[PDB]
């Protein structure tokens, strides 16, 4: 039983590298985090900040979620992130991605007790 909080860590946390390691980063990370197992996940963002710093976003700027729920939070500081986007030639099971590094404010949805990130909504 993977919890929602653990799923967010698997799908979205990568504190180990300070930035998009290489042009192959998304190709390796989308696979190793199990985001290409059943299908090529089309887009996905990894955050290169400490877990504590990302969890703290749940007490930062409350903003509307893209789905219209109210439990989304925008980081006051910018964070190092890597966006992964599936290439046009990518065909499962050989999912292929472009790796793009950015420094943006993240928006996450938070739930539970403790109140922790469960969904990556956007970067701005």
From Swiss-Prot:
Keyword Secreted on entry: yes
Sugar-modified residues: 1, 7, 34, 37, 41
Binding positions (substrate): 7, 10, 41-45, 66, 85
GO molecular function terms attached to this record: lyase activity; nucleic acid binding; ribonuclease A activity; RNA nuclease activity
Subcellular location: Secreted
Keywords assigned: Disulfide bond, Endonuclease, Glycation, Glycoprotein, Hydrolase, Lyase, Nuclease, Secreted, Signal
Main location: secreted
Cellular-component GO terms for this entry: extracellular region
Catalytically driven reaction(s): an [RNA] containing cytidine + H2O = an [RNA]-3'-cytidine-3'-phosphate + a 5'-hydroxy-ribonucleotide-3'-[RNA]; an [RNA] containing uridine + H2O = an [RNA]-3'-uridine-3'-phosphate + a 5'-hydroxy-ribonucleotide-3'-[RNA]
Active-site residues per Swiss-Prot or TrEMBL entry: 12 (proton acceptor), 119 (proton donor)
Reported tissue expression: Pancreas.
Protein EC: 4.6.1.18
Disulfide bond sites: 26-84, 40-95, 58-110, 65-72
One biological process term in Gene Ontology: defense response to Gram-positive bacterium
Effect of residue 12 to A: Loss of activity
Superkingdom in the source lineage: Eukaryota
Effect caused by changing residue 119 to A: Loss of activity
Oligomer and partners: Interacts with and forms tight 1:1 complexes with RNH1. Dimerization of two such complexes may occur. Interaction with RNH1 inhibits this protein. Monomer.
Physiological role: Endonuclease that catalyzes the cleavage of RNA on the 3' side of pyrimidine nucleotides. Acts on single-stranded and double-stranded RNA.
UniProt record similarity statement: Belongs to the pancreatic ribonuclease family.
Name the UniProt record assigns to this protein: Ribonuclease pancreatic
Native source organism of the sequence: Bos taurus (Bovine)
Full-sequence portion shown in this chain: 27 to 150 of 150
